[PDB]
Amino acid sequence: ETLNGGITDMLTELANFEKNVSQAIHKYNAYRKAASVIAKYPHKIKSGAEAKKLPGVGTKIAEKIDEFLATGKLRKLEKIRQDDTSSSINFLTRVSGIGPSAARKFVDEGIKTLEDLRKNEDKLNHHQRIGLKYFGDFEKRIPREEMLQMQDIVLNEVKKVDSEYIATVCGSFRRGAESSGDMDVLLTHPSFTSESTKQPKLLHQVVEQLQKVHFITDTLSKGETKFMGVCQLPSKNDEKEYPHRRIDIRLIPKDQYYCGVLYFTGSDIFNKNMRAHALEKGFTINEYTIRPLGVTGVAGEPLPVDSEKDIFDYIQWKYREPKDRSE
DNA sequence: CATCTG
DNA sequence: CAGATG
Ligand SMILES: [Mn+2]
Ligand SMILES: [Mn+2]
Ligand code: NA
Ligand code: NA
């Protein structure tokens, strides 16, 4: 956790680069298990050969760990941190809508900067365009104080459209958190579930309302169950307009809301632990459901949930207020 | 995983 | 349709 940090860190720099610059998914994948194991490792790795001893740890890594222990640096890491190409890709990538794949093409065409991008707005698709337009706003965290206003709106409007809607803002917002990166709204409706054959309007009606009132500003992606957008709290009495925030809205069959809501609420750690305990308790849990575990190996059949309560109960556990869902 | 692009 | 992005 700090005993083999540098090592796990450099490993991660390397791993990342294989994947983002080169295409070395294998190698990439290589540095990854490596850090994963050294990460777990109980002692202070004093040398390569020692590490080597571990699984995932081969000869090349070993080598690298040595140079790093040997000197506060690694040549290769130093070579990569300079190199403009490598840099460009890590940068372009910051634009919403540009993955590495695209980052490569651009750089190879000579687009390496924000300006470059503007000048070639032609080569970008809608998502990317938006991503470019809101570069700054998108990188800005979301203060809970804005979150509440946001949540306040969405909730009111969904209500207007149909009393039967059920929305929840999951994410860290939900677990307390003073600020967040984006807004994640979970949505269901009684009339939408597991077997029920669709109802697209279910998700399209709300989106529309939100745009109606000008909360949602742009569309990144609109499907029948998932919507990726941009929203914004109405700038009061002109002098202070808000940033543009990322927002997502997803439809869920009522017969699996809570599991979803449980799940999205996280933290990752809380999940796992709960996940592991469910397992003990003779159960199964994933994004959408909880199932009684047979003995023959595994086994299914969706246990029926009406709240986050129903879940814990099942696995027989202390109902956890979202705040203390941390780890 | 669901959506988009081409 | 494969392949990209979130
Ligand atoms: Mn989130
Ligand atoms: Mn998001
Ligand atoms: Na990106
Ligand atoms: Na292939």
CA separation for the pair A222, A228 (Å, rounded): 6
Percentages helix, strand, coil for chain A (3-state, rounded to 5) are 50, 15, 35
> What is the architecture, at CATH level 2, of domain A84-140?
Orthogonal Bundle (1.10)
CA separation for the pair A43, A139 (Å, rounded): 38
Structure solved via: X-ray
Active-site entry in A33, A40, A60, A64? A64
Q: Which helix (H) or strand (E) holds A217?
A: strand A216-222
> What is the architecture, at CATH level 2, of domain A264-326?
2-Layer Sandwich (3.30)
Rg (CA), chain A: 24
Tell me if A12 sits within 8 A of A31, measured CB to CB: yes
Tell me if A161 sits within 8 A of A205, measured CB to CB: yes
| Residue A148 main-chain phi, psi, to 5 deg | -60, -45
* Residue A6 CB in 7 A reach of strand C: no
* Residue A105 CB in 7 A reach of strand B: no
Query: What is the amino acid identity at position A79?
Result: K
CA separation for the pair A10, A50 (Å, rounded): 17
Tell me if A74 sits within 8 A of A9, measured CB to CB: no
Beta strands A166-169; A183-189: pairing state: antiparallel
Same fold, A1-83 and A84-140: yes
Q: Give me the resolution in angstroms, 1 decimal.
A: 2.8
> Could you say which DSSP state residue A186 is in?
E
Q: How many angstroms separate the alpha carbon of residue A23 from the centre of ligand 4? A: 14
Listed in sequence order, the DSSP H helices in chain A are 5-20, 25-40, 48-52, 59-70, 75-82, 84-92, 100-107, 114-119, 126-133, 135-139, 144-161, 201-212, 257-265, 268-280, 308-314
Cα distances (Å, whole numbers) of residue A251 to A99, A129, A164, A207, A315 = 26, 26, 13, 11, 26
Residue closest to A202 by CA, chosen among A142, A162, A147 = A162
Residue closest to A302 by CA, chosen among A191, A192, A194, A168 = A194
* Residue A102 CB in 7 A reach of strand C: yes
Which option is the CATH number for A1-83: 3.30.450.190, 1.10.150.110, 3.40.50.150, 3.30.565.10? 1.10.150.110
Class of domain A141-263: alpha beta
Q: How many CA atoms lie within 13 A of A122 on its CB side?
A: 2
Tell me if A8 sits within 8 A of A31, measured CB to CB: no
β-bridge partners, A292: A283
- At residue A232, the 3 state secondary structure works out as coil
Q: Indicate if A64 belongs to the active site.
A: yes
Owner of token pair 């490792």? A41
A95 annotated ligand-binding residue:
yes
What are the extents of the domains in chain A?
1-83, 84-140, 141-263, 264-326
Separation of CA A287 from chain center: 14
